[PDB]
């Protein structure tokens, strides 16, 4: 209870008003501060113990951001729109050594969100589900985190069907993008760690912190 899709949508709206790799990294760092604010706007998130709020954010920040800029790029032809309002095209990503992962973002996420015309309410519920990941290690009470996740997709399921009566399977379709998001989020992390190791590519404070241990 007390997990309405109206609150989630508001959250999504309340936050988002020369090297391409360095640009994408600065946008990520900038979006991390906003991500925290976003999470606080998701009902019940703040009522959880601070220790679990840290685990959930550190555990899902990457997928939370990939999902956001992906939906934001729905109007971009072959590229993505960065928080800094700057663009990154397929060719530019390819010329930076990250062509493969960039394309997976376009094919598995961006293009798909556009084809099904995923709305901001659906995106928010998806992100809230990711946020409330009960598999996160360290959680003091993985039970409550699981309870929250269930309420999110429950309100989402109701939102769907009602908003899209012609599409009985729209709900399941949404959830089925999560496996791709997990995989793509994991590949993004491997890249980042390598970048940090090498030394090149400027990495801001907040983004650097997420790459810390554990």
């Amino acid at each position: 209870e007390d997990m309405p899709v109206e609150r989630i949508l508001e959250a999504e709206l309340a936050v988002e008003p020369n090297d391409p790799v360095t640009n994408i990294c600065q946008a990520a760092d900038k979006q991390l501060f906003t991500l925290v604010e976003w999470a606080k706007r998701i009902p019940h998130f703040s009522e959880l113990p601070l220790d679990d709020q840290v685990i959930l954010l550190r555990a899902g920040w990457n997928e939370l951001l990939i999902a956001s800029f992906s939906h934001r790029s729905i109007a971009v032809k072959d590229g993505i729109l960065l928080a800094t309002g700057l663009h990154v095209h397929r060719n530019s990503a390819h010329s930076a050594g990250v062509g493969a992962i960039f394309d997976r973002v376009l094919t598995e996420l961006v293009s798909k969100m556009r084809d099904m015309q995923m709305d901001k309410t659906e995106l928010g519920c998806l992100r809230a589900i990711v946020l409330f990941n009960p598999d996160s290690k360290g959680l003091s009470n993985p039970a409550e985190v699981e309870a929250l996740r269930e309420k999110v997709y429950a309100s989402l399921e109701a939102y769907c069907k009602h908003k899209y009566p012609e599409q009985p399977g729209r709900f399941a379709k949404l959830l089925l993008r999560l496996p791709a998001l997990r995989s793509i989020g994991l590949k993004c992390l491997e890249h980042l760690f390598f970048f940090k190791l090498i030394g090149d590519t400027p990495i801001d404070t907040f983004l650097m912190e997420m790459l810390e241990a554990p």
Binding site: V36, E37, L50, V54, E209, E212
Partner: peptide
């Protein structure tokens, strides 16, 4: 550890 993250969540 996790300096930044804690400060932002607390405020």
């Amino acid at each position: 550890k996790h300096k930044i993250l804690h400060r932002l969540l607390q405020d």
